Design a protein around this ligand. Structure first.
Ligand SMILES: [Zn+2]
Lengths: 131, 51, 154, 135, 89
RNA sequence: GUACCGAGUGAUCGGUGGUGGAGGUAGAUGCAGAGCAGAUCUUGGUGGUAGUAGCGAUAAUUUGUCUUCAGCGGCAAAGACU
RNA sequence: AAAACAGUGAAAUUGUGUGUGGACCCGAAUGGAUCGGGCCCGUCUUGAAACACGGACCAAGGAGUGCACAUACACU
RNA sequence: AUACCACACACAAGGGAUCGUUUGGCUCCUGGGACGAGGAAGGGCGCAGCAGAGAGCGAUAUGUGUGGGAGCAGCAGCAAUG
């Protein structure tokens, strides 16, 4: 049960809040679980998927496959994974997008600011965990 | 006619730049849903009231 | 894809269909009606005579107040007509099926027009101005067409 | 399906051949397409059917009601009960002399198999037995 | 006659664009606008509630009024170079 | 939603075979914006009449030739008109 | 003013094919000619099949409701 | 009635009812009740690499500072020197 009356439980309101999200709230939509080993290598339980990271598909047509993330579509919430595609009548191949939550991370791309992003989150935990 | 005031001329100039179809590249954009520009006019079918 | 209005085998038949054609509906079905069950070479010969005013199309359903004519006696009626615009279209359509027949490896002979039908397409709107400040409709009535010809068993 | 209630076997044909096939169509439903066939009583001031002139059709009423014993009886000599569960057949265990079961349309294939198996061992007649499960 | 033939003579134009309201309703001979009463200081009485709500605050852009509300929310902080003047006052 | 078949004096109810592609009832009670043929009813869609009535006040048009792809369109030569 | 899903896709109305009839309904039948009975509904009116008015056709919408105050009945 | 007119059924047309769905409306409650001579409210005109309408913004028409951090929806180009 919910006892805070400032938070809404309306279906109409929850749905609008989802689809009209922007900025950091949009980034929260692209989160995926880490594998059991990585959850010992790092403190975090889940992270936003980025290009170059390595993922196992755990639901759908392409179940059991593994591959590298090629692109991240923020407007239509989908991820393109290397080697997951369909062939047209022409023989031409189109990558099919997968929803973030159907993936699981196997190796992290550590290019750019990723190491600082991870550090910032670990500290935020401990700050309140140790109190 | 040939004699015009400055105020009448600016109204004609603005009414002439607005009278154009949707550019052909916009139709390819993922989020774009318009078919035809409903604000297009013809001198044979409407008056501007520039007077 | 198109669902033709009846069931005949793909082997031993040839087909065509067109949509929204801009020949006039009522004129076209009077043409189609008379060439049903006719042999294809006979059909093409007959339609050539209509273009030259040597033979006519008889009329039976869309026929009120029509003119009487000695050429109609060949079909046991008095009433007939010469709808040039519809005849030119149907003639072209039939000639193309002989190309298809030849290319497909049937004979150019013993082909008989087994099925043919016309349907109404949606109206194209127009206007005419009348007296006392009124406006009245002035629309156009196009058509859709199907044909299937088959080889006689004989 | 060719089955009959054993208590009525030597009588069922007399019963069936005795049932009326009269229909009570609404007045002038034959004249305009906007009036459906479903019965409504005419209430006009001039109306020839309400006033019961000879040559107009007949109106419904209590005189046409069937005898209390024959009423509701299917042509196989049983009355019907609707079922949708295995636990429904359990009700018929005392009544199987006069009543039979009809599985509701929305029950799907996998479940129908379980209903029919139970019907066989309890000794209950099911009239939709073939149903969708012919394939 | 009073119908079609009299329509041919209708080539003069009594109203032009008003400089206060845009509405092509300034009567040149009377020296007055029929929408907004220019050149009188106050705006005209509008005929009914339906017609007046079409020209109320919030029907346009409200540029200044929106900024003022944001500044009030923030506590009127001013330009940060000049904090010392603010603090003294 | 559509064909058939059964049950009821009747308002209506049930099943079977194709189509459709995600929700739905049976019993007892509660609240109502709760049942249509009509109002020169309101809105939207479609017939018969009908390939019919009409489409041609004014100076007028013919021949060749190219396009057009089938425009008395353009160009030459005549014939007219304001 | 109109205009939701690139779903489902009714009726009016049209073409083709196959059957049955010559406006149609009720009662009763034949291998087959048909026999008997029936004027067009709604409405005002002493009185309508009317030379009384409304109605070309189909879909969808479309008319005894809420509150206050006394009241008789049924139920607690 | 060979071909017209009517009705029934199957297939193709013609129209948008029905059922399933909804980032909209309405009602009640709680907060708020903040404009202008330091030029308001309202009107006009300009500003994009390809740009009509609408949105955003004023010739500084995506500038500065703080907190964050991965892409910019099409095509060509940009981006941890943000
Ligand atoms: Zn003004």
């Amino acid at each position: 049960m919910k006892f805070n009356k400032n938070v809404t439980a309306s279906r109409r309101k929850n749905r609008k809040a989802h689809f009209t999200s922007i900025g950091l709230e949009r980034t929260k939509l692209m989160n995926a679980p880490l594998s059991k080993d990585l959850k010992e290598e790092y403190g975090i339980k889940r992270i936003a998927v980025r290009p170059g990271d390595m993922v196992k598909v755990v639901s759908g047509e392409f179940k059991k496959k593994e591959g590298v993330v090629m692109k991240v579509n923020r407007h239509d919430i989908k991820i393109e994974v290397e080697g997951c595609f369909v062939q047209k009548e022409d023989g031409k191949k189109i990558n099919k997008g997968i929803h973030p939550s159907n993936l699981r991370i196997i190796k992290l791309s550590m290019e750019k600011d990723r190491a600082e992003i991870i550090n910032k989150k670990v500290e935020a935990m401990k700050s309140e965990v140790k109190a | 006619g040939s004699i015009k005031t400055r105020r009448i001329k600016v109204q004609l100039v603005s009414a002439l730049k607005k009278n154009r179809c949707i550019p052909q590249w916009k139709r390819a954009c993922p989020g774009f849903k318009q078919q035809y520009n409903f604000t297009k006019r013809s001198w044979k079918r409407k008056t501007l009231k520039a007077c | 894809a198109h669902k033709y209005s009846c069931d005949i085998s793909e082997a031993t038949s040839v087909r065509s269909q067109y949509n929204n054609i801009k020949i006039k509906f009522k004129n076209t079905r009077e043409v189609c009606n008379i060439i049903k069950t006719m042999e294809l070479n006979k059909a093409i010969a007959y339609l050539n005579d209509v273009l030259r005013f040597k033979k006519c199309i008889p009329v039976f359903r869309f026929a009120k107040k029509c003119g009487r004519t000695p050429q109609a006696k060949e079909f046991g009626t008095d009433k007939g007509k010469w709808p040039v615009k519809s005849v030119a279209f149907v003639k072209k359509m039939l000639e193309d099926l002989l190309v298809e027949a030849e290319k497909k490896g049937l004979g150019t002979s013993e082909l008989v027009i087994k099925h043919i039908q016309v349907n109404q397409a949606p109206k194209i709107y127009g206007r005419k101005h009348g007296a006392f400040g009124r406006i009245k409709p002035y629309n156009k009535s196009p058509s859709h067409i199907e044909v299937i010809a088959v080889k006689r068993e004989h | 399906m060719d089955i009959v209630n054993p208590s009525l076997s030597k009588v069922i044909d007399i019963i069936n051949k005795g049932k009326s096939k009269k229909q009570f169509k609404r007045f002038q439903s034959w004249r305009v397409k906007r009036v459906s066939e479903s019965w409504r009583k005419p209430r006009g001031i001039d109306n020839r059917m309400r006033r019961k002139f000879g040559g107009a059709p007949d109106m419904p009423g209590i005189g046409y009601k069937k005898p209390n014993a024959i009423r509701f009886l299917l042509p196989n000599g049983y009355r019907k009960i609707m079922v949708a569960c295995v636990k429904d057949l359990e009700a018929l265990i005392s009544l199987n002399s006069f009543y039979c079961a009809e599985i509701r349309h929305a029950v799907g294939s996998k479940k129908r198999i379980e209903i029919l198996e139970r019907a066989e061992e309890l000794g209950i007649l099911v009239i939709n037995k073939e149903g969708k499960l012919v394939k | 006659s009073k119908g079609t033939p009299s329509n041919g003579k209708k080539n003069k134009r009594n109203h032009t664009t008003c400089c206060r309201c845009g509405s092509v309703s300034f009567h040149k001979q009377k020296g007055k606008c029929s929408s907004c009463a220019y050149p009188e200081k106050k705006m005209k009485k509008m005929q009914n509630r339906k017609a007046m709500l079409k020209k109320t605050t919030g029907t346009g852009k409200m540029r200044h009024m929106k900024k003022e509300r944001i500044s009030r929310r923030a506590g009127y902080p001013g330009n940060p170079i000049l904090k010392e003047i603010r603090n003294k006052i």
